[PDB]
Design a protein around this ligand. Structure first.
Ligand SMILES: Nc1ncnc2c1ncn2[C@@H]1O[C@H](COP(=O)(O)OP(=O)(O)OP(=O)(O)O)[C@@H](O)[C@H]1O
Lengths: 733, 13
């Protein structure tokens, strides 16, 4: 009895229509009740209830029954959501013709005009044939929520949704392979479209929301290195403002900024310290955030031996004078072998301003022998300003602050340069990014547009280990993933010269996995007992092998990156030659691929991209593919998310059959198992991994995690070559 | 916060 439509015209309620829809969306699901849904939604209907409202109501109805015991409600809700969005975008369930859609969207200025110039209407007709709009039915409610909220092209003021997932994927393919010769262009478009619509390959939010639209901004994270100079400080700051203004994560290395008290100009003026500048980079970072809060993230890096280290380590400590705190940025403490030995031998660590110890800073990242030489030399030399601190004290201080805030990260710089794709002497890795997985060369700017500066970027993607059947599927998947991002590099715009410089110079990519947890469950391994070591070794060898192959194949086609000669890859060196040897004692799986054939092929034809893999975290992308995030174990079987539209629940993949197979985050007795697996993955990974360390207070006497335990785990990670360490989760129930 | 250096000393980096 009485319903209102979209024009605002009444009509009587035919309740079999609704039922039909529910009936349709339930097709194939197990354990869902259409009556349950009907019952819960019919009670909230009323005379003249907008038709849209009816849709929302049954969607929520379905959405509110999501559960571990009835996980198909996810798909029932999803489909209803998909149906509604169809009507919302097209005024009907059936999506328009690809060509008709693109024309319309070009005329409305929602899509890039180049699409119509780059492809012919018959080409668009051809692409349409690749599309499979029923794939929309494979998304899980949470996923549809993500697509609707941050992927699908829409009007943010009015609310209007202008497209559908399949169109998004086809046009992302179309745009990324638009410069291909016509003999293979559409073959690639089709292959990549299938790869992404069947969730084999995940692509970052910026790419997914924008590639197809008129924008050209797609970089999610930047790495700026700051020289010790007002000009460089100013330059750095300017770069950050431009980059956070395009919503990018910032990773800043401010390690050479000389210490407080250091001479300036001679003896005419003494330095003011690093903090004042850190505060300045922090305002730069939050310059485009509501008030000075909402968004804009950064992670600043400094050597453990910096003279102001003890003041830098407590910058997030809340209990402290305002002037001696830079609380809204995460920090990455950089350690090397020598520092750890100081700890183990119960010795001292000497603190030094980088400005007063010629060659130390470079040595630290590029040459450990030379670092050690210089370090001891300057320890003796009494002319050099310095400070002694007890290694245990320093380490404990750092771990304390890491334990309390969770955000004091570690970067093992020796591991970052002895086991990397680059030549430490020519292009060392002296920092990471926001989430501690990127590891690339950087050069300080002396001005925003300085052409001799170098800024690293994150050009990412990921394989879904839950969606491949065998590891040999990664050969085609790696082809597509490498070929699309490489295209992206030429596709997008660079706001700062230095950022283009490194992009074109080295063409560095960072491809990782999502769904690791589910994959291990599928093979009956766990994280904590070492049961997954060899499988992990097997799996990451495939990933790296096929990515290097794809890049090598691409170099043949289009030429290696300009700066390929600064890579160790160029010198015939491979990941399997410089990994951390201790790894041998925790896994015996033998290399299955022909690395030596490849070694030569790389030597001969080079690599298109200087770096190819990087294991980054992933909330969104994982959500769309209903996959456990990146390489982390799930906290629980059902994940809750808040929204204006209600509570969002997502059940881990195949909970039905794998509930006992999973090993949930807090079921692991400690971090060893996991730190082993990260070490194994690092053997083959070009860049770094976002490793986490987790602690449950319940597992310790008096509920207090022992510092001994914290240092033990830190040393473990170093022992197996872990490059960086990100979050520390302390459970708290 | 209690840290034993002897326990850690024998560790092999
Ligand atoms: N007359 C109606 N009575 C009850 N529910 C309706 C009615 N019309 C549409 N709905 C419901 O609203 C949604 C569709 O909204 P919309 O008005 O766009 O549907 P429609 O397909 O155009 O409807 P109709 O069948 O009248 O042509 C579905 O969930 C459907 O069950």
């Amino acid at each position: 009895l009485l319903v209102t439509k979209r024009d605002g015209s009444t009509e009587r309620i035919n309740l079999d229509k609704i039922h039909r829809v529910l009936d349709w969306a339930a097709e194939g699901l197990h354990n869902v009740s259409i009556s349950q849904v009907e019952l819960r939604s019919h009670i909230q209907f009323y005379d003249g209830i907008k038709t849209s409202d009816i849709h929302e109501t049954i969607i929520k109805a379905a959405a509110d029954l999501i559960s571990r015991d009835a996980p198909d409600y996810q798909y029932l809700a999803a489909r209803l959501a998909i149906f509604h969005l169809r009507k919302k975008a097209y005024g009907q369930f059936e999506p328009p013709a690809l060509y008709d859609h693109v024309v319309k969207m070009v005329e409305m200025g929602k899509y890039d005009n180049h699409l119509l110039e780059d492809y012919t209407e018959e080409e668009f007709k051809q692409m349409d044939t690749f599309i499979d709009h029923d794939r929309d039915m494979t998304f899980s409610y949470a996923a549809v929520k993500q697509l609707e909220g941050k992927y699908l092209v829409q009007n943010r003021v009015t609310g209007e949704i202008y497209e559908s997932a399949q169109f998004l994927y086809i046009l992302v393919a179309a745009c990324l392979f638009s410069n291909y010769p016509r003999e293979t262009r559409l073959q690639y478009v089709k292959r990549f479209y299938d790869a992404v619509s069947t969730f084999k390959i995940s692509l970052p939010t910026p790419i997914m929301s924008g590639v197809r639209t008129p924008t050209r901004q797609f970089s999610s994270c930047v790495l700026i290195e700051c020289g010790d100079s007002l000009d460089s400080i100013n330059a750095t700051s300017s770069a950050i403002v431009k980059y956070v203004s395009q919503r990018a994560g910032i990773g800043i290395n401010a390690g050479r900024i000389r210490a407080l008290g250091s001479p300036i100009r001679g003896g005419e003026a003494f330095h003011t310290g690093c903090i004042p500048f850190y505060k300045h980079f922090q305002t730069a970072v939050k310059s485009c955030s509501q008030g000075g809060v909402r968004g804009g993230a950064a992670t600043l890096f400094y050597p453990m031996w910096h003279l102001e280290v003890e003041s830098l380590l407590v910058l997030k400590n809340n209990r402290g004078v305002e002037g001696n705190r830079v609380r809204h940025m995460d920090y990455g403490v950089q350690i090397n072998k020598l520092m750890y030995t100081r700890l183990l031998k119960g010795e001292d660590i000497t603190l030094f301003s980088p400005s007063d110890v010629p060659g130390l800073y470079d040595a630290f990242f590029a040459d450990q022998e030379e670092f050690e030489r210089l370090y001891t030399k300057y320890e003796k030399d009494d002319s050099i300003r310095k400070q002694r601190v007890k290694a245990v004290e320093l380490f404990s201080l750092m771990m304390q602050e890491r334990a309390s805030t969770g955000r004091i990260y570690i970067q093992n710089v020796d591991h970052c340069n002895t086991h990397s794709p680059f030549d430490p002497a020519i292009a060392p890795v002296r920092q990471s990014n926001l989430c501690l997985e990127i590891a690339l060369p950087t050069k300080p700017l002396n001005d925003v547009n300085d052409e001799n500066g170098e800024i690293a970027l994150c050009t990412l993607s990921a394989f879904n280990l839950g969606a491949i059947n065998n590891l040999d599927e990664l050969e085609e998947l790696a082809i597509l993933a490498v070929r699309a991002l490489d295209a992206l590099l030429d596709y997008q715009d660079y706001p700062i010269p230095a950022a283009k410089r490194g992009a074109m110079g080295r063409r560095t990519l960072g491809i990782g996995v999502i769904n690791f947890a589910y994959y291990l469950a599928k093979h009956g391994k766990r994280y904590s007992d070492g049961s997954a070591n060899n499988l992990t070794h097997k799996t990451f060898e495939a990933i790296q092998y096929y990515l290097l192959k794809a890049s090598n194949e691409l170099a043949k086609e289009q030429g290696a990156c300009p700066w390929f000669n600064e890579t160790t890859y160029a010198k015939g060196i491979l990941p399997i030659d410089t990994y951390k040897k201790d790894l041998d004692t925790i896994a015996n799986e033998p290399l299955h691929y022909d690395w030596e054939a490849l070694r030569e092929s790389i030597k001969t034809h080079g690599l298109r991209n200087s770096t190819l893999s990087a294991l980054m975290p992933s909330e969104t992308s994982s959500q769309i593919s209903n996959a456990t995030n990146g390489i982390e174990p799930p906290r629980g079987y059902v994940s809750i998310k808040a929204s204006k539209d209600g509570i969002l629940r997502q059940v881990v993949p195949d909970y039905e059959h794998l509930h006992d197979a999973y090993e949930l985050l807090w079921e692991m007795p400690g971090n060893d198992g996991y730190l082993q697996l990260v070490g194994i993955m690092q053997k083959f990974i070009d860049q770094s991994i976002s490793a986490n360390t987790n602690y449950d207070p319940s597992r310790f006497p008096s509920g207090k995690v022992p510092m001994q335990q914290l240092l033990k785990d830190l040393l473990t990670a170093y022992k197996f070559g872990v490059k960086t360490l990100y979050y520390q989760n302390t459970r708290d129930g | 916060s209690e840290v034993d250096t002897d326990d850690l000393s024998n560790f092999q980096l």
